[PDB]
Amino acid sequence: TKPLDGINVLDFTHVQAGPACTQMMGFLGANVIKIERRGSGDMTRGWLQDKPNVDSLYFTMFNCNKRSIELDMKTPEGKELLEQMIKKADVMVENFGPGALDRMGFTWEYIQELNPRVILASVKGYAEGHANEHLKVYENVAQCSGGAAATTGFWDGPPTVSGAALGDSNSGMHLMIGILAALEIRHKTGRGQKVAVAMQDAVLNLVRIKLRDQQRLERTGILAEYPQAQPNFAFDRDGNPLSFDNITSVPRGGNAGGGGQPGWMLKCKGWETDADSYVYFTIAANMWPQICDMIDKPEWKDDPAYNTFEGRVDKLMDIFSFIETKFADKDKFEVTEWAAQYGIPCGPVMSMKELAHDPSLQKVGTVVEVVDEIRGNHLTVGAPFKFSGFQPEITRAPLLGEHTDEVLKELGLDDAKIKELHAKQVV
Amino acid sequence: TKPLDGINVLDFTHVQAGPACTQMMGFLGANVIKIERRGSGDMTRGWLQDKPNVDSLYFTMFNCNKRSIELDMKTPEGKELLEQMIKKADVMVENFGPGALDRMGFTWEYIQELNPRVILASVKGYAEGHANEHLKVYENVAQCSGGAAATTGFWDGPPTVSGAALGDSNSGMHLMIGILAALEIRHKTGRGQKVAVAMQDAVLNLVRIKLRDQQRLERTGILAEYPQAQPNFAFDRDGNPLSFDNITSVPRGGNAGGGGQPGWMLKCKGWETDADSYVYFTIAANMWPQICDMIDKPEWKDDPAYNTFEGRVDKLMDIFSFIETKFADKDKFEVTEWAAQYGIPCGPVMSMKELAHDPSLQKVGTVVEVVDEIRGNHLTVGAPFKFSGFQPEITRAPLLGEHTDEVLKELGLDDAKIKELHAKQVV
Ligand SMILES: *SCCNC(=O)CCNC(=O)[C@H](O)C(C)(C)COP(=O)(O)OP(=O)(O)OC[C@H]1O[C@@H](n2cnc3c(N)ncnc32)[C@H](O)[C@@H]1OP(=O)(O)O
Ligand SMILES: *SCCNC(=O)CCNC(=O)[C@H](O)C(C)(C)COP(=O)(O)OP(=O)(O)OC[C@H]1O[C@@H](n2cnc3c(N)ncnc32)[C@H](O)[C@@H]1OP(=O)(O)O
Ligand SMILES: [Cl-]
Ligand SMILES: [Cl-]
Ligand SMILES: [Cl-]
Ligand SMILES: [Mg+2]
Ligand SMILES: [Mg+2]
Numbered sequence: 019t020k021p022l023d024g025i026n027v028l029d030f031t032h033v034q035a036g037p038a039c040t041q042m043m044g045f046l047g048a049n050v051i052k053i054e055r056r057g058s059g060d061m062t063r064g065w066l067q068d069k070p071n072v073d074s075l076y077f078t079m080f081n082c083n084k085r086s087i088e089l090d091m092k093t094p095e096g097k098e099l100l101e102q103m104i105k106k107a108d109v110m111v112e113n114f115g116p117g118a119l120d121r122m123g124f125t126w127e128y129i130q131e132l133n134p135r136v137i138l139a140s141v142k143g144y145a146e147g148h149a150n151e152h153l154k155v156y157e158n159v160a161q162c163s164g165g166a167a168a169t170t171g172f173w174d175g176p177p178t179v180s181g182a183a184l185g186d187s188n189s190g191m192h193l194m195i196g197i198l199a200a201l202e203i204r205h206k207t208g209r210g211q212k213v214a215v216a217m218q219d220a221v222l223n224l225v226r227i228k229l230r231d232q233q234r235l236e237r238t239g240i241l242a243e244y245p246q247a248q249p250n251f252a253f254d255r256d257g258n259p260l261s262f263d264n265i266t267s268v269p270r271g272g273n274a275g276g277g278g279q280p281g282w283m284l285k286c287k288g289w290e291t292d293a294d295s296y297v298y299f300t301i302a303a304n305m306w307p308q309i310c311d312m313i314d315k316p317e318w319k320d321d322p323a324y325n326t327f328e329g330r331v332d333k334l335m336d337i338f339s340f341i342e343t344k345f346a347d348k349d350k351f352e353v354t355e356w357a358a359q360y361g362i363p364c365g366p367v368m369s370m371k372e373l374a375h376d377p378s379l380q381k382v383g384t385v386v387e388v389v390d391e392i393r394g395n396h397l398t399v400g401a402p403f404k405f406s407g408f409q410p411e412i413t414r415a416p417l418l419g420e421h422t423d424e425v426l427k428e429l430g431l432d433d434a435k436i437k438e439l440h441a442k443q444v445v
Numbered sequence: 446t447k448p449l450d451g452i453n454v455l456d457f458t459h460v461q462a463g464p465a466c467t468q469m470m471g472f473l474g475a476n477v478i479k480i481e482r483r484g485s486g487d488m489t490r491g492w493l494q495d496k497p498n499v500d501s502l503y504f505t506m507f508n509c510n511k512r513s514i515e516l517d518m519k520t521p522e523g524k525e526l527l528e529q530m531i532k533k534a535d536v537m538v539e540n541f542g543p544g545a546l547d548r549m550g551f552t553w554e555y556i557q558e559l560n561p562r563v564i565l566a567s568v569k570g571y572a573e574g575h576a577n578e579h580l581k582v583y584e585n586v587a588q589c590s591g592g593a594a595a596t597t598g599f600w601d602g603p604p605t606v607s608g609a610a611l612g613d614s615n616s617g618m619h620l621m622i623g624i625l626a627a628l629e630i631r632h633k634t635g636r637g638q639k640v641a642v643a644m645q646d647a648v649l650n651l652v653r654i655k656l657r658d659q660q661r662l663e664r665t666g667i668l669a670e671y672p673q674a675q676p677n678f679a680f681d682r683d684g685n686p687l688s689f690d691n692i693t694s695v696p697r698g699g700n701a702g703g704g705g706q707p708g709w710m711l712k713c714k715g716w717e718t719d720a721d722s723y724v725y726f727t728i729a730a731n732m733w734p735q736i737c738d739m740i741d742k743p744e745w746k747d748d749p750a751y752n753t754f755e756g757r758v759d760k761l762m763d764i765f766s767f768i769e770t771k772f773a774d775k776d777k778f779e780v781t782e783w784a785a786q787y788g789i790p791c792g793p794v795m796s797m798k799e800l801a802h803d804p805s806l807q808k809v810g811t812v813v814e815v816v817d818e819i820r821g822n823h824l825t826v827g828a829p830f831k832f833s834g835f836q837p838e839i840t841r842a843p844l845l846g847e848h849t850d851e852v853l854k855e856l857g858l859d860d861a862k863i864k865e866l867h868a869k870q871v872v
Contacts, residue, residue: 019633021626034704038653046626065705066657068664075657076705126833145809145831153785158700158708158725159792167710167794168721169608171598176710177723177794179700180607181596182588182651191618191650196830198625199448199473203834205632206446212833219811219829222800223618224609226826227461229812230502232797233824237495256717267798269720273606277461277503277613278584283594283603290682293696296604298589358580365586367604370659371694373592373649382572384646385656397660399653402646403623404572406553406639408630 020047020408025201028100028107028136029053029084032060034157034183035141035217036113037080038190043109043197044083045401045410051103051425052086052416056443059086059418072393078415079398082388086416087425088445091122095444100124102429104132109197113141116152126212137200137210141189145216155217160185164221165268169228172272173245173252173260189220227277231268242331243280244271251335279303280327282338283367286350294372297353299341300363301334303327308360313344383410390414419445447474447835452628455534456480456511459487461584461610462568462644463540464507465617466624470536471510472828472837478530478852479508479843483515483870486845499820505842506825509815512848515872518549522871527551529856531559536624540568543579553639564627564637568616572643582644587612591648592695596655599699600672600679600687616647654703658695669758670707671698678762702727707758709765710794713777721796724777726768726784730754735787740768810837817841846872 022043027050029040037060044050054060062077090096104110110129112119119125119140126138143155143163150163158179161167171178182188196213203211222229231241240262246252246269252260260269273283281300289295301309306325310318318324323333330337345353350366357364368376374397379385386400392414401410422445426436439445452475456467464479464487471477481487489504517523531537537556539546546552556565570582571590585606588594598605609615623640630638649656662668667689672679673696679687700710708727715722728736730753734746745751751760772780777793784791795803801824806812813827819841828837849872853863866872 019630021629023633034654042622062705066661066670068661075660079653079657145811147809148805150805153792154790155792156706156708156727156729156790157703158710159727159790162723162725162792162794165795165797165800166607166609167723167725168796171605172602173720175599175602176700176712177721178598178605179703179710179725180593180609180611181655181697181703182593182607182609182611182648183654183703184607184609184611184651187651187653188615191622192829194622195469195618195625196832198622198629199830200832201629202448202625203446203832206450207834209834211835214831215829216809216811216831218806219809221609222806222811223826223829224611224614225797226465226506226614227503227610228608228797229801229824229826230506232801233502234493234495236798243493254717267721267796270608273585273603276584276606276608277610278586281585283585283589283606285603293600294595294604294694296589296594298586298594298606300583300586354580361581363581363583363586365580365582365590367589367594368592369595369694370592370652370655371663374656374659374663378571378575378577379645379649382574382643382646384572384643384649397656399649399656402619402642402650403626404641404643405623405627405630407634407636408638 022046022048025049025108026106027051028103028110030110030112030114032113033062034080034186035190035193036111038187039141039193039197040111041080041082041084042191042194042401045412050084052081052084053089053091054086054418056088056090056445059088063418073415073417075396078388078390078393078396081415082398082412084416085421085425086418087422088419090444093444095439095442097123099444101132104129104136106429107133107136109137109139111139111193111197115154116142133210135204135208135210137197137204138212139193139197139200140214141193142214142216144218146214148216155185157183157185160217160221163218165225165228166221169225169268169270171270173270174255175270177270184221184224185217188224189215189217192220192223228268235265235268243275244269245274245335247331248335249332275300280334284338284342284345286345286353287347288349294367294369295350296367297345297350297364298367299338299357301337302363305362308362312357312360312362313341386412388412388414392417449473449475452476452535453533454478455530455537457537457539457541459540460489461507461613462617462620463538465614466620467538468507468509468511469618469621469828470624472839477511479511479513480516481513481845483517483872486513486515490845500842500844502823505815505817505820505823508842509825509839511843512852513843513846514849514852515846517871520871522866522869524550526856526871528559531556531563534560534563536564536566538566543569557637560637562631562635562637564624564631565639566620566624566627567639567641568620569641569643571645573641575643582612584610584612587616587644587648590645592652592655593648596652596695596697598697600697601682602697604697611648611651612644615651616642616644619647619650655695662693662695670702671696672701672762675761676759706730707761709762711765711769711772713772713780714775721794722777723794724772724780725792725794726765727790728757728764729790732788736789739784739787739789813839815839815841819844
């Protein structure tokens with residue numbers, strides 16, 4: 019019915035990457051038990067709160083479909099409690115620092131002894147065996163490590179961070195592939211495995227297209243689809259010309275097409291006061307006649323200076339600036355509608371306000387209103403994969419330690435034994 | 446044992462999103478049969494070739510661990526071949542336009558009729574049910590649709606695309622989670638499902654943090670950690686101080702942290718001639734005196750308006766401007782090690798030439814040199830998930846129609862039938 023019905027997940031994860039993974043597993047039916055430290059819990063509970071003493075949207079948008087237990091794991095009685103939980107678990111997920119889980123006496127070797135079928139899944143900054151294996155890494159450092167910062171932004175500006183979570187959430191989704199892959203192994207062998215994703219590596223996987231460019235750049239000396247390939251277009255902050263004559267590593271291309279065909283971010287009406295009043299407009303090679311029709315340049319259809327990719331290289335940025343002139347009195351939706359008539363790939367820059375209140379995204383289950391009778395309802399992002407015979411049922415994030423007694427009951431413990439654990443301050 | 450050994454994948458995909466999913470399935474041991482159009486095949490083959498009449502790096506880096514068959518599906522004998530293949534398939538993957546397989550006679554109900562166990566996996570632009578259900582979307586258009594472009598870049602510049610493939614490869618990785626999930630459903634129900642990932646939703650999943658920020662902004666009217674919330678720092682195009690007074694949708698924050706822990710991108714030695722001579726510097730609350738030890742400012746530990754997040758989030762660009770001054774004579778690696786002495790989270794902007802030839806990444810199998818005896822060797826990105834009981838074996842991408850007869854012989858067709866299919870121009 020739901021993909022991960024009956025999968026028990028022992029969840030040690032905190033902050034963004036790990037919780038993203040286990041929340042999505044939760045959305046697909048997994049039984050997720052969140053192990054948190056006493057008093058404070060996941061640090062996201064108290065970061066960027068919109069209301070004092072209420073769990074922040076940081077926490078609640080990453081921790082739906084979970085239960086929370088409190089546990090001091092650096093105590094003898096906390097360690098025997100884990101062992102019982104590990105024996106019930108199908109998957110153990112963690113994103114502590116590199117040596118953290120081993121130094122608690124729960125090495126992969128010992129975990130295998132406790133439960134032969136359990137999968138250990140971890141997110142790290144860098145892969146095991148890497149020179150930076152032992153480093154603690156945060157979102158933007160991870161983007162810098164994996165090639166994304168170097169290849170994002172403008173030639174005359176700094177390396178630029180992406181607003182998308184290429185380090186954290188991306189690494190969590192990659193780990194989900196790892197976990198589900200290990201579940202498929204287990205069907206054959208009957209044994210669990212260890213799966214690990216480095217944030218640097220998850221970033222690199224998405225920057226594969228720029229490793230393509232690096233090799234083209236080495237082999238040929240030029241990237242013809244880049245703005246710097248147009249003579250006399252790009253300059254540094256001191257007015258020096260930028261060209262591929264002197265470029266040996268993949269440059270920042272502004273709003274160039276990347277893995278798509280050539281494109282640019284073009285202003286629409288009201289761009290001076292509206293930060294998101296833009297479209298992205300693509301010049302696909304086989305759509306040049308249609309573009310010529312749209313912008314009333316019939317003379318450009320038969321001109322070899324304009325009618326091939328190769329002819330347009332010395333003037334592509336001039337072509338985009340001319341096209342942009344046609345959008346000066348039209349908003350982004352009107353431009354997108356106009357382009358659609360011609361079959362030209364083109365779409366608006368959607369603001370976060372526009373996305374948060376879009377009826378379509380709520381219709382399809384991608385933006386979801388979570389019912390939270392304790393904190394008030396909030397929006398979250400649902401499952402991005404849609405299935406023919408399954409619908410996620412998203413439910414609110416747990417309060418700290420809300421299910422501690424509930425899970426101890428399930429472990430076999432009776433009332434008196436729980437009373438002792440509370441008294442010893444282990445839970 | 447590899448996770449997807451024995452999984453037959455009937456692969457119709459082209460360009461990036463679809464092929465990234467099936468390649469990665471191939472890396473995990475899947476049997477990927479790439480259906481390609483006679484005489485031309487996947488568009489990437491001729492897309493920015495570095496060598497005339499040799500398959501491009503775009504093709505080779507997205508199509509390793511696959512076999513190629515040429516097939517004319519708009520013929521009666523071709524449809525008969527496809528039906529035999531669909532009966533052997535575990536997963537069918539496509540990124541055609543809406544209704545393409547329907548128009549070839551292969552609706553879902555008919556696929557189910559041929560094979561009740563087969564999974565049909567699709568990438569699309571917008572989710573089924575969306576108002577933009579049929580708009581064409583690729584890479585940067587999808588980045589614009591899902592909120593990433595709006596929230597990436599600078600307040601006084603345009604919405605900015607990520608160099609990371611937030612649209613294409615990210616959707617492909619998300620589809621891989623969907624496919625593995627549908628394989629888990631099948632273990633219980635014994636039936637195949639449809640699973641689909643829309644590019645917009647794949648992008649939205651990674652901008653969950655900005656949907657958090659949009660709700661915070663709506664609820665409180667301000668985002669305290671954003672540059673626009675700092676005392677006279679962000680200036681609009683007209684050279685006047687910015688603030689959240691007229692900001693109702695999540696703005697662009699340049700190189701800010703994007704979470705609970707502030708940061709900025711800082712220049713290192715050689716930045717005027719080396720575009721990637723930078724470090725990212727993160728102020729994490731749990732090592733603030735450590736930063737004060739490195740920066741040699743002991744007055745800020747004692748000062749209450751410097752030692753806490755609430756106190757420090759109005760001196761913020763004043764602090765980064767200061768720290769950058771003493772990286773003036775040091776390269777990014779020297780600066781990173783100098784910070785690492787004090788346990789500070791500081792990391793270098795890695796260029797693509799550094800990443801392409803980094804020994805560590807090749808040691809861990811994240812950057813892999815592919816032995817390609819036909820075209821000459823090339824680099825690619827490997828599997829970002831590392832497993833304890835399994836190693837991917839990456840093999841070169843197929844020539845067009847290289848495995849046609851090999852695949853036909855597996856369907857059980859004789860040498861007479863195969864040679865007349867060539868003569869009939871079906872394969
Ligand atoms: S997506 C952005 C975050 N990046 C990652 O997910 C990458 C992996 N995570 C990390 O590198 C670190 O976890 C980061 C996120 C950098 C935070 O660093 P911390 O300073 O918080 O270091 P740890 O997370 O490893 O935690 C420190 C020690 O605390 C112990 N601990 C946690 N929870 C408990 C409980 N419940 N009970 C007892 N101890 C607990 C950890 O074991 C760890 O122990 P050390 O021995 O001190 O390492
Ligand atoms: S990372 C972002 C990357 N950006 C891009 O990819 C932008 C460029 N993309 C494109 O131009 C198109 O998306 C391409 C790659 C050309 C794919 O277009 P389609 O989705 O239409 O796929 P096809 O070109 O392969 O199909 C065209 C029509 O022909 C039918 N068809 C496909 N393959 C075959 C074979 N082997 N045999 C017979 N017929 C085949 C399709 O069903 C399709 O039919 P329509 O009914 O016209 O849709
Ligand atoms: Cl995230
Ligand atoms: Cl495109
Ligand atoms: Cl694609
Ligand atoms: Mg050069
Ligand atoms: Mg006209």
